[PDB]
């Protein structure tokens, strides 16, 4: 670790987190689909979306885990995948000073089970996912828009939603109220093509098709 | 390098002749009405059309249908092709059937009455490729060109 500019490696954590992944997969074969640990030492558990409550409850309550805090719950839109939405749970264990990421998937129409029974923090996070991505969480206390305007139609954070949207607001003196109209921009957003034609990272080269 | 001519000498507004006899700007409504009135009045061979070099197929068929509905078949181009025999009835009579890529597989090429360097710059470059890599033989029946 004497290279000034290169991030040091911590193999002790990599061995520790890798073993715990084997521990979870052995205990929860019914739902675990993949376990991976990264170069910068973070463990990811990838599960079938029907094991959200079983897996989260086990991690929260098992004595060799105790992930009592839900740091974040979010989603990622990957259109090419037939299940375009990736649901990510990031959990913190104060007892063992460790973090684990849990990943599952869903599509536009398939619901996910709400994690509120496991973590009461998930109430608002799940509302945000619905508002921004359109994913429905079943058996939620109150699922409704949280970040978008009242009556806003669409799910902005999907990759197919235009950045500037479809409608814009202004005040009209005739009707003496704020009205919504289709969006016209005096200056169109300028799309810059920045990707270089030359590969940068060989280690991630995808196998030829 | 010819894209810069698309920014000069452009037609931007409909134009019609005034009493003096000079073209003046007007609207689509007026101009289309003047044109349509004559189309209704005249019929048959009194209506004709000529298609230029940079015309799209969508417009060509559109114009054909409009003139057909006045029973006019005088749909013409500016580029002559013999109408004798099977004329345009058979595609093979007026196509480069060997394809551009076929020149690479050819053994002899006979050029008649054409400067492929200027009429089809990229087609001549294909000939020279075969001339270079496949030892093609080329003959010409025309003015000696480079």
């Amino acid at each position: 670790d004497t290279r000034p500019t290169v991030r040091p490696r911590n193999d002790v954590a990599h061995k520790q987190l890798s073993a715990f992944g084997e521990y979870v997969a052995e205990i929860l074969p019914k739902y675990v689909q993949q376990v991976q640990v990264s170069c910068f030492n973070e463990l990811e558990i990838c599960i079938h979306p029907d094991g959200v409550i079983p897996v989260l409850t086990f991690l929260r309550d098992h004595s060799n885990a105790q992930f009592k805090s839900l740091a974040d719950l979010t989603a990622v839109d990957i259109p090419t995948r037939q299940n375009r939405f990736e649901i990510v749970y990031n959990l913190l264990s104060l007892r063992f000073n460790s973090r684990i990421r849990v990943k599952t998937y869903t599509d536009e129409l398939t619901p996910i089970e709400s994690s509120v029974p496991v973590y009461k923090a998930a109430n608002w996070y799940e509302r945000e996912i619905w508002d921004m991505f359109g994913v429905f969480f079943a058996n939620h206390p109150d699922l409704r828009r949280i970040l978008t305007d009242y009556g806003f139609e669409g799910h902005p954070f999907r990759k197919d939603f235009p950045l500037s949207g479809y409608v814009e607001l202004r005040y009209d003196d005739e009707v003496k109220r704020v009205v919504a109209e289709p969006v016209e921009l005096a200056q169109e957003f300028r799309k810059f093509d920045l990707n270089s034609p030359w590969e940068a990272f060989p280690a991630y080269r995808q196998p030829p098709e | 390098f010819a894209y810069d001519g698309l920014k000069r000498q452009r037609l931007t507004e409909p134009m019609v002749r005034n009493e003096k006899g000079l073209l003046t700007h007007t609207t689509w409504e007026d101009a289309l009405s003047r044109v349509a009135g004559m189309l209704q009045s005249f019929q048959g061979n009194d209506v004709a059309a000529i298609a230029g070099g940079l015309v799209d197929a969508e417009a060509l068929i559109a114009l054909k249908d409009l003139l057909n509905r006045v029973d006019s078949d005088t749909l013409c181009t500016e580029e002559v092709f013999p109408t004798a025999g099977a004329g345009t009835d058979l595609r093979s009579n007026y196509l480069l059937n060997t394809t551009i890529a076929g020149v690479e597989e050819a053994d002899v090429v006979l050029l008649v009455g054409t400067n492929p360097r200027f009429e089809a710059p990229l087609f001549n470059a294909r000939i020279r490729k075969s001339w270079l890599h496949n030892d093609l033989k080329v003959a010409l029946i025309g003015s000696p060109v480079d």
């Binding site: 202004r170 003196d173 109209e181 289709p182 016209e184 | 700007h25």
Partner: protein, 342 residues
């Protein structure tokens, strides 16, 4: 067409419509609606104003950046008019006072000034001139307001022959001084009417309909040189119309007849106001002047507009004249006024 005035866009705020308009008298009831419709579709509007700039602030949000331009002008300076119309394709005259100030009379605001704008507009090569007169303008009318309107209507037509002249009826709207005039009569107890308002017939028209028709006249080649009459769908008796106003406002209606000579004297007593008079001898005569039926003149239906019934747009105007008890009463609680059939 010059390349700058060629229309582009989908008719929104940031679009281009090819309309470069000078609107005189834009700081009033009619102008604020005209400028809004002009600025909706991306038109360049020159707003020549006499008033304090604070009183033009409500116009600034009506147009995208640079599409509303403000100039100072004086109806007695012919050069100030020229600077405002020289670059414009259509000029709209909405200038007028319902009273006579010490400096400006009815002749100044309905004859002298409109003729000056028309004379300068032609000298500067403006294609279109839209002039607003009054449906009941007549040389032999009692009201000086209306007689001066007739004089100006003739001067405009002689100075700018291709001018479109639009002759509205009484216009009702949030800022009208028509339905609000009647509703504010509650302050003085009952409603004084001449002959109890059984001899005056009114045909009021909605402001938006007028705004749409004016705009469509700008965009219609046929409208040039014509004289239009903007009237509402239905004709009402003044008594019935006033009664409907109070019913919507849910205020007690105590109509009492007042002879012609008396309700003239009350006007003269309200004309002494150095500010904006509450009523005047002229307004008296006009409210009680029966609206003409001019079938020889084209109407809104010729310009594409559909007349808006009073029964649908009265509540928006008259709900601010209600008490808290009756504020929430709906549009279906007041049975519509009686209409004179055609």
């Amino acid at each position: 067409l010059h390349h700058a005035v060629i229309p582009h866009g989908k008719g929104g705020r940031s679009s281009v419509s090819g309309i470069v308009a000078t609107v005189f008298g834009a700081t009033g009831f009619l102008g604020r609606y005209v400028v809004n419709h002009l600025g909706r579709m991306g038109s360049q509007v020159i707003v020549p104003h006499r008033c304090e700039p604070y009183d033009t602030m409500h116009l600034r949000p009506m147009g995208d950046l640079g599409q509303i331009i403000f100039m100072d002008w004086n109806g007695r300076d012919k050069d100030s008019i020229r600077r405002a119309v020289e670059h414009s394709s259509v000029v709209i005259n909405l200038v007028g006072r319902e009273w006579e100030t010490q400096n400006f009379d009815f002749e100044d605001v309905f004859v002298k000034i409109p003729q000056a704008i028309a004379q300068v507009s032609k000298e500067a090569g403006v294609e279109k001139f839209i002039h607003i007169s009054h449906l009941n303008a007549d040389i032999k009318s009692s009201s000086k307001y209306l007689r001066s309107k007739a004089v100006g209507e003739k001067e405009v037509r002689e100075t700018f022959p291709e001018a479109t002249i639009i002759k509205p009826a009484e216009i009702f709207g949030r800022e009208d001084r028509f339905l609000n005039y009647f509703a504010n009569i509650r302050w003085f107890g009952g409603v004084p009417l001449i002959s109890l308002g059984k001899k005056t017939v009114k045909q009021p028209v909605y402001i938006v309909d007028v705004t749409k028709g004016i705009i469509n006249a700008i965009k219609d080649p046929d409208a040039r040189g014509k004289t239009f009459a903007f009237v509402g769908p239905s004709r009402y008796l003044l008594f019935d119309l006033v009664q409907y106003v109070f019913a919507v406002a849910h205020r007690p209606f105590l109509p009492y007849p007042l002879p012609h000579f008396a309700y003239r004297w009350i006007g003269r007593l309200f004309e002494i106001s150095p500010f904006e008079p509450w009523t005047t001898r002229d307004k008296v005569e006009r409210i009680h002047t029966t609206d003409k039926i001019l079938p020889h003149l084209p109407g809104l239906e010729d310009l594409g507009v559909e007349a808006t019934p009073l029964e649908l747009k009265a509540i928006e105007v008259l709900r601010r004249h209600r008490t808290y008890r009756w504020l929430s009463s709906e549009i279906e609680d007041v049975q519509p006024a009686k209409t004179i059939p055609t």
